[PDB]
Amino acid sequence: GINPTLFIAQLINFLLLIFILRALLYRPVMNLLNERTRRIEESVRDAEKVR
Amino acid sequence: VGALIISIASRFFLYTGPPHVEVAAEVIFDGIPGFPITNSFVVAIIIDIFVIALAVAATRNLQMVPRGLQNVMEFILESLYNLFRNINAKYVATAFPLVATIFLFVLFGNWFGLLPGVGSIGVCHCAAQGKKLVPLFRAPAADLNFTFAIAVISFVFIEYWGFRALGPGYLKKFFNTNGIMSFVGIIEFISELVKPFALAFRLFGNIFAGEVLLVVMAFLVPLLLPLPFYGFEVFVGFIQALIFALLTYAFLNIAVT
Amino acid sequence: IASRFFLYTGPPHVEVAAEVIFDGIPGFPITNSFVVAIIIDIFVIALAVAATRNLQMVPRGLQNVMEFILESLYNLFRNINAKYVATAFPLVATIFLFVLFGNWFGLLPGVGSIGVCHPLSSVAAAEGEEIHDTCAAQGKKLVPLFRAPAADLNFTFAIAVISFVFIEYWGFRALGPGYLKKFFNTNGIMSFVGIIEFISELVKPFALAFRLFGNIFAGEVLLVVMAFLVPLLLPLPFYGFEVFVGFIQALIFALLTYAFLNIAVT
Amino acid sequence: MEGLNLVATALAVGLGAIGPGVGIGIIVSGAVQAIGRNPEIENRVVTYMFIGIAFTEALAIFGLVIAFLIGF
Amino acid sequence: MEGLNLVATALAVGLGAIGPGVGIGIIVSGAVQAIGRNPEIENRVVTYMFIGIAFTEALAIFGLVIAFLIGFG
Amino acid sequence: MEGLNLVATALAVGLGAIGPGVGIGIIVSGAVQAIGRNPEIENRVVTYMFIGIAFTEALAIFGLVIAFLIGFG
Amino acid sequence: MEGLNLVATALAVGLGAIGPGVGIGIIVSGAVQAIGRNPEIENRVVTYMFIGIAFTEALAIFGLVIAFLIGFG
Amino acid sequence: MEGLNLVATALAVGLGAIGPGVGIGIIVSGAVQAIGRNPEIENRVVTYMFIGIAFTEALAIFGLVIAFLIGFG
Amino acid sequence: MEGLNLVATALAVGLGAIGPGVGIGIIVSGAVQAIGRNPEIENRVVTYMFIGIAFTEALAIFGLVIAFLIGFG
Amino acid sequence: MEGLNLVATALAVGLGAIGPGVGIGIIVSGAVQAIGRNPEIENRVVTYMFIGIAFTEALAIFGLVIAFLIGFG
Amino acid sequence: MEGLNLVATALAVGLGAIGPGVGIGIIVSGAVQAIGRNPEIENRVVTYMFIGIAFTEALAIFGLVIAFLIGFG
Amino acid sequence: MEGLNLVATALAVGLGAIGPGVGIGIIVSGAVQAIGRNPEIENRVVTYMFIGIAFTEALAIFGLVIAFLIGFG
Amino acid sequence: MEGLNLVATALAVGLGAIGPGVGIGIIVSGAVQAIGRNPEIENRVVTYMFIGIAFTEALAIFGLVIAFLIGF
């Protein structure tokens, strides 16, 4: 394929997919991982607080 | 199983014919007065549907303890996040969604190419009839436009992020040194210029070589002969996806530094 | 510096030819290399006589340089084998001195310039000039009276044959009938190794003579081609490399002769 | 002169197999040797090993792609 | 020339089996030298070796595929 | 007689890929061994190795672009 | 011009043997070095050695069989 | 012959990528190994590496100049 | 032409000398170095050495017998 | 039939860049390895490094002179 | 044509020089290093070295013999 | 055809640059490494390096002289 | 066609330069390294060193020999 119109169409398709996927599960999974590591750090801090 | 396999002579009973699959460009799927629908655009949309379906199935619950499909979805994301944390420190969050998408999409594209009916199922445009057969579900990475698009978005991403991180320094590099970066600098510039060509050509050639390998090994003996090559191909699809992701992230990391 | 490389005075071409026979008016005709070898031998004899005529403690001058060269050669020879450090010194030292003199004679002015014969003229817009020579008349080729003695196959072949004969005589002096026991001993696979070693020993003098003659001829041809390329200032590094290589090869020939003698002995 | 394009394709694919093949061999051998000496640094090593293998395969695929352009 | 086809097929195979063979040998020698010391990494490096071996085979098989593309049109 | 430009393009690409492939292979092997030996000197190492892979690749690309001038133009 | 097929067979066996042979040599050298370093892992090394040899032999096997397909119909 | 001019540039640039590419590769491998072994000798290592790279790239420059002369006439 | 058979057999024998020759060289160098390091296991690796030698010789023999099929036709 | 000399010119440069530069690289590797362990010996070894580089460059200059001779008659 | 036999013999001898020459070079370098590391086992390794040479040169000898056959009949 | 003499000269010179260039590079790298690791032994090591360089350069000059004889004979 | 004897001689001498040249390079590097490690055995190894070169030289000479057999 050489035509620039089809090339730009496929490029825009890829941009739409990356934008919808980054707002569908990437942000929830990143927030879940951040919450998990925050939970680990507060568990350590709370064990220190228990002592 | 025994090694006295007698079914290896199945080419007499089942002859697949010459390797007619030799097209290096796209073929139109359905006649539409607008822009043509390629054999790769339809499978790209199919992969979009599959990825969206698995994403919404694995994140409909957002369970604290991942199990089943959620753990499968989370494991690869954790592995990629740790990999990019190993490569770079503070630029993981800035580039993670783009690299993750450009990895998963090409992974499923290369994995779809090994699915049955890619080189067999097609639409007339059939040798018995007057219309020449064209294959259906041609892998998106085999198409040159998709590879050029991902290469050029990678180039735009790396250039924009390097410029943003380095101010005016990244725009003209360090050509004013005149002692060392006077002949190395132009070499680095032309390497950056030809980097998208290399990135697109690697995937395009790898997938094209894989599919023509499948066709030729079906041509030679279509029974128990192309099995190790099919295993190698399903391995190398994931390998090439990981290669593309790791190389674009490493190029970003070396450009910002 | 970068604007004085004028090409208005350069050779029309590169004269690459084999050994040229001289006129030879009397009997036993000689060649152009024979006269150069005779002159080099006369100069070496004169230098040796000057060194020997004034010999005492605390040497100084040409005698000091000759003594330093002799001491370095003796140390190099004793580093290999001390059994024949003094016995094999003569032929190797003479060959090294003659080779060094012949190599140094090739860089002297007049090599390929004087023809015994038994800017406007230069072509414009060309990398090489087209200036005719003095002996271009009468269909001559401007036969070089002065040439490198090592640039002829006869002298190199004679030196290699003499070195091989000396090595063989020194081996046959005190080694018993060990050549038969070492070559084709008919003891398992050692016979093939002995045959290969005998073939290599037979081909070694030819290899040495060919190497010396080819090195001299290629150095002369490279110097001529460099002169034809640019008239001046271009071939200075090439000339320095050739000057170093002449002495390197002169020492290497003696070292190889001593090593061959030691290997024949052991 | 028929069949010259076939010879061109063969030469290109053969040279692209010869060069990057030895490059891949050298890269993998060096990386596994470093891992065997220092297993702790393996995670930092494997990424650069893949980068090198990617560059070698990029050259080989350049050869193969030019061969494909020649054949058609 | 009429005979340039088969030679090309040969030039597709013979030139395609030089570099992959050396790469396979170097890969196996490196894996063996890395298994002589710390054989508890015996899995991992061999896995990487498998990765490497596949790549080498890939290049080789490319030539073979091209050979068939020259062998039978 | 008439297919010489295709042969020229193929030879240019193949000979531009055969050398730099081994060059980048030995570059990566040396850089990996240096990384495993001394991880504290990694940063400069990485830059230098990239400078190395900046050079040889460009040479290969030069051959490629020469072939790009040979196949077309 | 009818003898080009013989040259094709010769090239296909020759260049197809120069690759795997050097690789086999490197494999055997590495295996023997590992046995010198660690004889207790020796058997395991030997196992992998054959695997490597087989892969090279596989290429050599290819370098034979298609050669017959060049020699014969 | 109508051709035999594109092939000249092709071969010239290809072999000028063969030689200097592997030379620069070995230069970079040795330099990075020495850097890993010795950190504080980096200045002389870099200077000698650049000198060797320039001396090796002189041949590639000569090849590119010869190819440009052949292509332009 | 009428001399392509001689070229074929000559190239086949030459490449059969190229490949197994380097294989034998590497095998012998590695085996000798390991034996000098540790002579106690020497005999064992010698067997493997010979095994490797045989395999390399086999490849040469293959080329040779192909040249034999070119020698007589 | 007519432009072959031009191709010859390429060879007279092309292969002429293969041997020296790679060797030059090898030299540099050894040289830089000699400074990775022994800093103060640089004055002794850089001279020999330059001698080897000059010898390889002399081979390259022989190639370039042959290219000039066959490029102008 | 006319010089096909001469080209065949020359190529065969050249290939039997490039292969076995490097093979025996590797053999001698490895044997010399092993002897320097262990002079007590020297005899044994020397014999092995000779055996390796007695193989490698043999291959070259075969090539020369083949060339002589092409030279004679 | 017509200009085979110039092609032969270029090929001989290029191969004589290919081989002995790598030989000289290996010799100089080994000598410099040994001097760096043993600064009290170069008094004969340099001479041995020079005689090995003389052997390799003699082979290169053999190639150059044969090429000159082809071009002027 | 022109004389193929010139091409034959050129190829033979060039390959005889390629092969034994690298062989001599490897031999000299190994001998120099061994001498630098254990000088007390140097004579023995240097003897063996020359032997190796001889064989390589013979191979190169062999090519030159057949080159002359093609020259005249």
UniProtKB/Swiss-Prot annotation, chain A:
The gene is atpF. GO terms for molecular function: proton-transporting ATP synthase activity, rotational mechanism. GO terms for cellular component: plasma membrane; proton-transporting ATP synthase complex. The chain crosses the membrane at residues 1-20. Belongs to the ATPase B chain family. The chain holds residues 5 to 55 of 164 of the full protein. It is found in: Cell membrane. This is ATP synthase subunit b. F(1)F(0) ATP synthase produces ATP from ADP in the presence of a proton or sodium gradient. F-type ATPases consist of two structural domains, F(1) containing the extramembraneous catalytic core and F(0) containing the membrane proton channel, linked together by a central stalk and a peripheral stalk. During catalysis, ATP synthesis in the catalytic domain of F(1) is coupled via a rotary mechanism of the central stalk subunits to proton translocation. It comes from the Bacteria.
From Swiss-Prot, chains E, F, G, H, I, J, K, L:
F(1)F(0) ATP synthase produces ATP from ADP in the presence of a proton or sodium gradient. F-type ATPases consist of two structural domains, F(1) containing the extramembraneous catalytic core and F(0) containing the membrane proton channel, linked together by a central stalk and a peripheral stalk. During catalysis, ATP synthesis in the catalytic domain of F(1) is coupled via a rotary mechanism of the central stalk subunits to proton translocation. One of its GO terms (biological process) is proton motive force-driven ATP synthesis. It is found in: Cell membrane. SUPFAM superfamilies: F1F0 ATP synthase subunit C. It comes from Chloroflexus aurantiacus (strain ATCC 29366 / DSM 635 / J-10-fl). The chain crosses the membrane at residues 7-27, 50-70. One of its GO terms (cellular component) is proton-transporting two-sector ATPase complex, proton-transporting domain. InterPro entries: ATP_synth_csu_bac/chlpt, ATP_synth_F0_csu, ATP_synth_F0_csu_DDCD_BS, ATP_synth_F0_csu_sf, ATPase_proteolipid_c-like_dom, F/V-ATP_Csub_sf. It is a multi-pass membrane protein. This is ATP synthase subunit c.
